[PDB]
Design a protein around this ligand. Sequence first.
Ligand SMILES: Nc1nc2c(c(=O)[nH]1)N[C@H]1C(S)=C(S)[C@@H](COP(=O)(O)OP(=O)(O)OC[C@H]3O[C@@H](n4cnc5c(=O)[nH]c(N)nc54)[C@H](O)[C@@H]3O)O[C@H]1N2
Ligand SMILES: Nc1nc2c(c(=O)[nH]1)N[C@H]1C(S)=C(S)[C@@H](COP(=O)(O)OP(=O)(O)OC[C@H]3O[C@@H](n4cnc5c(=O)[nH]c(N)nc54)[C@H](O)[C@@H]3O)O[C@H]1N2
Ligand code: F3S
Ligand code: FES
Ligand code: FES
Ligand SMILES: [Mo+4]
Ligand code: NA
Lengths: 135, 135, 824
Amino acid sequence: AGRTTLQYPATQVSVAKNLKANEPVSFTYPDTSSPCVAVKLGSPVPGGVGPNNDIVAYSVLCTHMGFPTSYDKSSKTFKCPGHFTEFDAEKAGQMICGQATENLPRVLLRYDEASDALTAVGVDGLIYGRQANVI
Amino acid sequence: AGRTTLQYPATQVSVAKNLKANEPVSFTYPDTSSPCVAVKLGSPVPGGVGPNNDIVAYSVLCTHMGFPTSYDKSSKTFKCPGHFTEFDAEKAGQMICGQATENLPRVLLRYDEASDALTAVGVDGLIYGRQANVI
Amino acid sequence: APNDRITLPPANAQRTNMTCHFCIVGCGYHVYKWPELQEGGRAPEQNALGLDFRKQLPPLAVTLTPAMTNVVTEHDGRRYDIMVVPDKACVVNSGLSSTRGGKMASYMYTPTGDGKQRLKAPRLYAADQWVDTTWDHAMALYAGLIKKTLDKDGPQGVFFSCFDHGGAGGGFENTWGTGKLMFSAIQTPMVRIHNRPAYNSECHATREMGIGELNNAYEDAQLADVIWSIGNNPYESQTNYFLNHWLPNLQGATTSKKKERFPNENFPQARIIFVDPRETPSVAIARHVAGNDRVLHLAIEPGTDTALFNGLFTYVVEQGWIDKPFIEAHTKGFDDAVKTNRLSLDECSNITGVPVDMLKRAAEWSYKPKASGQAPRTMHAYEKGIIWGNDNYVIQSALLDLVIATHNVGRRGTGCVRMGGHQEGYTRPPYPGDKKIYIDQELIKGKGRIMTWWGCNNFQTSNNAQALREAILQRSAIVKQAMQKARGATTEEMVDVIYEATQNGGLFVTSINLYPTKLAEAAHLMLPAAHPGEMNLTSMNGERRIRLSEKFMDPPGTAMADCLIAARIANALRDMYQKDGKAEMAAQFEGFDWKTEEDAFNDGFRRAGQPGAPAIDSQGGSTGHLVTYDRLRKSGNNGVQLPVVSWDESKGLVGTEMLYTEGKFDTDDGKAHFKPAPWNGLPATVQQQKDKYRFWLNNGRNNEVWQTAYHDQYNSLMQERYPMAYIEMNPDDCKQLDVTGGDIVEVYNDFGSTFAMVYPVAEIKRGQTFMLFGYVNGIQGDVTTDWTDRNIIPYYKGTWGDIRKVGSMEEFKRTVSFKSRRFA
Ligand SMILES: Nc1nc2c(c(=O)[nH]1)N[C@H]1C(S)=C(S)[C@@H](COP(=O)(O)OP(=O)(O)OC[C@H]3O[C@@H](n4cnc5c(=O)[nH]c(N)nc54)[C@H](O)[C@@H]3O)O[C@H]1N2
Ligand SMILES: Nc1nc2c(c(=O)[nH]1)N[C@H]1C(S)=C(S)[C@@H](COP(=O)(O)OP(=O)(O)OC[C@H]3O[C@@H](n4cnc5c(=O)[nH]c(N)nc54)[C@H](O)[C@@H]3O)O[C@H]1N2
Ligand code: F3S
Ligand code: FES
Ligand code: FES
Ligand SMILES: [Mo+4]
Ligand code: NA
């Protein structure tokens, strides 16, 4: 009852070195109704993780009206088929053009150098269609 | 989970017509370790309640370092003996002079015309010495 | 957002040290930083505070409010809770926080908080609009103009007004960086200081008499029999020195310690004397704590300090309440000062307005031998009521005479000290000129091509501020108009356009700052700076205690530490000169190969007095090299009092508590020197205002408001409480003008016109007023005169004006308390 934070689970995604450059992995976080992608971008970005500081992960539900967005490998963006919002995987989900009022939520990954493991430990931003990220 | 608000109790203080102009009543809210005062000021102030919109209530713990403040009837202020902070009971606990960085917390009163009851139902501001108003 | 809870720091949260950004006292704080989605438990061993939040905390257990918390967003985009709270084990503050230091977390930069409008990139006024520009372009334009000015006019064409202080917007790294740039590289003498319009000191007289102004410890205020507070409102202006050291003495909590140090000495109840025309919150609070009988308010006539101290000095000499052995062994000039400064109590009383009985009592409390035979230990603290008083140099002459004769330097529980303003953190090359120059007058008179305000805002804080603003806005406009013609120009052509406009009365204006400020009304170029916590920074407080404030977050955008801005400028200028084949000029810009602020510490403070080092004036002295970042970290918020006397790995830094304890002063002969102090009345310029107009326009600080309100102007609580600069007025005077609390008045005289909201104050004398200085809405300095003492020290407290009702601001009447700020 003192608690101001949400009780996020710790979910293993993969080991970093299994991920290939620009080949997205699908997983669910923080529950099986919340689809997410992790991707090794190939070049470092702010807040990227892993050996090359280039791994990023997102909720794929559009923050406009909640369709699952698809990752476009040629542009490293997530595109929404609903009303054509597009989000930048290289700029922490910054909306390039579109009708959302919130950036694509980032799944916060811990990378452990000792095990090479990528673990989803939280979410920065509010996932579509939820009162709180943790239902 | 799901809940963003604190679970404040509803505590009867008194009936409004028992209160005399500028004669403070003592009570505890939201528990017996949180001393408070209600006072009928005698002339309307913003957010004042009761028949003459002039009843206000506060946590009396100084928001600096938590000494119990005393109500001064001549000035309608709360004075802290600790480091000389003074709060304005007619300006929603506005600090007149002192070392606090928060106004004196207001105890939110419902006034029921049907019964003449004044009920403490919440707190605006954070009471000294607490992680949350409700422990 | 929510007002009714806070996120506790986890037990393992990162914790760094931070000195308060603001006033001289330099209270110690801890910064807890941890990821946004973690938090501590309420059990005491499950949070970093070690406090038990499972039930109500008692009084004094903590200082914690939402204003002391924040969430920062770093350059990696990740979000972190911060909590900035006072350090209970810091000797300075013992866990106290002023209302000003308490807001540090809120005034850290965040994209959505009070820091939202922090400068994040170079800003250019491109003739008719504000735009962003690159750092390279900014340096091409700024260094290009400096270079052109150096090449054609020499250094005399390049002007600065720059901080010389410590804390945020100052400190040893920053003062060195800027000083090296201005004095060793550019070599310009056209430099003034943030609070005074020439390159001078507040303390010429005391220093020349052999007494540096920060000569004691805060512990001395605990050991004193009597404290004088002269031209000083310390509860409001040096809060935690007064609360943590002065008040415990008045309350009797330090009596044990006096008696332990001095077994054969009587220690009466401590007493306090205030020399202040105005009855302040500090007077009120002293009386509440100690009683009326232990407080003496010498409510002198404005500007009569010299007459007060001459009358007191005369009297203690006539009574023999002086230390003749001390004078004989360790002073020069006493016999002469007795004659020059002679003034009877009756004459003293007539000039000051203080009754003779009160003059005698002050002397009795302060200087008459105790029953055990020793003179009282009387600490004489002074600040801006006399530093900006009627003839800075003469007042200090008068006061220091009284102090030296009564041996109130160099004994524990004494000192004749500045209370201080900002913290201190000065390490600079010597000033390169041979004369004092009134910089503002030179700008007003049309001199200089480029003017940089660096960590100051003289639009709000100059004396005769209206004349300054008028001139600068006009000169700025000439440059704006010239730029306007250009289309498609190279940077080098633009430099030429602007240079030419400055031959026609123009002035290019740069500001290096945290925020746009009112300077943005005239600036052409603004560069973003970083404050403590976004950088490492070193500084010392009013007892010379040096501390490291540790970096814990990134600055907004491409904001940079001021010392690194100075290195950037220097390196731009060097490159330009190397490219122009001028090896000799290039070499003047060497020695700025700095990657971090610590480089500036190593190059400046740590080289002072060292072999092969250039001339360096440093508050750290020649043992400054003993201080490193690492060593300061290990010291904690207690730091070390300068100068350092030794260091080793087992004992840490060991420093100096009190100055002058052996009777050796900083003069040629090691003696303290007495000085004549003539009483000449008010300056003519000021007396003329007084002859023409009704009200003494006293001015200065409010407890809640810091300086030019650069942060506070963005704080909704501050803005609700003080939406406009206020003027304390006597209620009888108010009725005569048909004004009450929340009315707006014009205040004016021959020097200017400004506005304030009326704050009736019973304790204000008829014909006297007090206006908040420096503020964002109603600048007080418009009505201060141009008059300065022999060293170009302004009489900021010396001006008179008339007052005219503008009208009733109903919104202020609904929202602002006009209740008394004098506690009883
Ligand atoms: N009438 C009258 N006038 C007075 C006085 C008075 O008593 N009466 N007092 C005088 C005195 S004592 C003083 S100290 C002066 C003050 O005059 P100023 O020095 O002009 O005022 P401050 O508010 O201290 O100015 C600090 C400025 O630096 C910026 N700043 C803060 N931190 C940083 C930093 O890290 N880097 C940089 N580059 N900028 C920074 C702030 O945003 C702000 O614009 O006013 C003087 N003026
Ligand atoms: N709350 C707060 N504290 C601050 C600051 C701030 O902005 N806000 N600024 C800091 C800085 S930079 C400084 S310089 C210090 C200043 O601290 P102080 O000098 O203590 O403050 P002031 O309010 O400028 O002036 C002190 C007193 O001088 C008195 N006075 C005016 N004229 C005369 C006179 O002729 N003789 C005498 N004897 N007294 C006179 C005034 O009534 C006033 O009470 O405060 C620092 N502390
Ligand atoms: S908290 Fe800061 S404002 Fe002065 S009194 Fe302490 S250093
Ligand atoms: S649902 Fe994605 S753009 Fe509307
Ligand atoms: S505890 Fe109330 S003013 Fe410090
Ligand atoms: Mo100052
Ligand atoms: Na004006």
